[PDB]
Write a protein that binds this ligand. Structure first.
Ligand SMILES: CC(C)[C@H](NC(=O)[C@H](Cc1ccccc1)NS(=O)(=O)c1cc(Cl)cc(Cl)c1)C(=O)NO
Ligand SMILES: [Zn+2]
Length: 385
């Protein structure tokens, strides 16, 4: 999924390893392009939210076990290189699963829609769904991306999937899509129970955020106002509490949104940019929104292809269905007050590996998830404050 092994020292080439500028909407950061439309910034997130980078503890913080605040984490290149080697490992772990592979494939193909012109006859990029890659002469070159994995802000364990919005457009909830930024650290993990029993496999924590970007990438995210959205996303049993006629009500709201995309494309006459033709980008979305193309060359939304895509995105792609595939132990519900944050290093193949995570085959750890047990495997889990 990441073809070439990256080191943080590896020289910039302005193609994959580059100094880049986030929409603000400031200074350039080293960032790696581990796959089409996926970039990884080994820095703390002091960029996405105007001056939310004091990066130093609040007046009174939640402490154990919800908030962690080290002002120094992800400052050393040695940590940044371990980070990228961290995140690259969880992606391949995720890719090794038939379901993570389909998911990233769903993430990579989910190009944020080109709905950036006030006109309705013209395709135009929404610069918020783009980064600025610095070229040799200091100048910047807009690149389109779907996903950025950047490290956390002040609270190190406050992992989330956020996105830049619009003056009028809800980009995650109108079928269009929006570049997704995932705050994440594979150098820490949350302990749960069912004495302090076990510990979350960071691939599960990562897979959770990729579910979320997926929903937002395809514009079928549920308004934040437990959230319905997190409920769809963790899956399992607690995904029955959802009024099915609030699920019907949405599975129809994002069909009529997908039909309004198909309209916008059919009515498109011009397009903006040097990059790509009106026809290249119409096939691009005709590939995203699995549209259908009659002889005239007018897109329609197939109610059947849309229903499998919506099913795959919303109820096939779930934390719960991920722990099936990962043969791991995970909180069976979203209400298991993780009563610790642990220090970890999943990079070494003796610590943790793509195929079995912490629960190493041919070891004591492969049974009753003894790899995940904070007691048995005390080396790999050091409780913090
Ligand atoms: C880190 C990540 C897993 C994240 N979860 C949180 O923010 C939870 C919120 C929450 C609320 C209710 C139940 C479960 C989770 N924060 S937390 O994971 O730090 C947490 C939750 C609880 Cl209930 C207690 C504690 Cl001490 C910490 C998330 O899902 N991003 O998409
Ligand atoms: Zn969630």
């Amino acid at each position: 999924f990441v073809n070439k092994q990256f080191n943080y020292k590896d020289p910039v080439n302005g193609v994959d390893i580059a100094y880049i500028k986030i929409p603000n909407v400031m200074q350039p950061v080293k960032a790696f392009k581990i796959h089409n439309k996926i970039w990884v910034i080994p820095e703390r997130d002091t960029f996405t939210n105007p001056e939310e980078g004091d990066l130093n503890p609040p007046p009174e913080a939640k402490q154990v076990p919800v908030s962690y605040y080290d002002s120094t984490y992800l400052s050393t290149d040695n940590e940044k290189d371990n980070y990228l080697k961290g995140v690259t490992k969880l992606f391949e772990r995720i890719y090794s699963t038939d379901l993570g592979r389909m998911l990233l494939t769903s993430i990579v193909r989910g190009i944020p829609f080109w709905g950036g012109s006030t006109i309705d006859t013209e395709l135009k990029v929404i610069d918020t769904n783009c980064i600025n890659v610095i070229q040799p002469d200091g100048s910047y070159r807009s690149e389109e991306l779907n996903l950025v994995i950047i490290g956390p802000s002040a609270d190190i364990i406050q992992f989330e999937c956020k996105s830049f919005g619009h003056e009028v457009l809800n980009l995650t909830r109108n079928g269009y899509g929006s570049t997704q930024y995932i705050r994440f650290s594979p150098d820490f993990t949350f302990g749960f129970e069912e004495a302090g029993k076990f510990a979350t496999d960071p691939a599960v924590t990562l897979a959770h955020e990729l579910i979320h970007a997926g929903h937002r990438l395809y514009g079928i995210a549920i308004n934040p106002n437990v959230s319905f959205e997190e409920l769809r996303t963790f899956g399992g049993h607690d995904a029955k509490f959802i009024d099915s006629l609030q699920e019907n009500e949405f599975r129809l709201y994002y069909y009529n949104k997908f039909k309004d995309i198909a309209s916008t494309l059919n009515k498109a006459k011009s397009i903006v940019g040097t990059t790509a033709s009106l026809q290249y980008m119409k096939n691009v979305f005709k590939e995203k929104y699995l549209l259908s193309e009659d002889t005239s060359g007018k897109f329609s939304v197939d109610k059947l292809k849309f229903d499998k895509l919506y099913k795959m995105l919303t109820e096939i792609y779930t934390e719960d269905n991920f722990v099936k595939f990962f043969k791991v132990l995970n909180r069976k519900t979203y209400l298991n007050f993780d009563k610790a944050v642990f220090k970890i290093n999943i990079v070494p193949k003796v610590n943790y590996t793509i195929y079995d995570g912490f629960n190493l085959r041919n070891t004591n750890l492969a049974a009753n998830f003894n790899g995940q047990n904070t007691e048995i495997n005390n080396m790999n889990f050091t409780k913090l404050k």
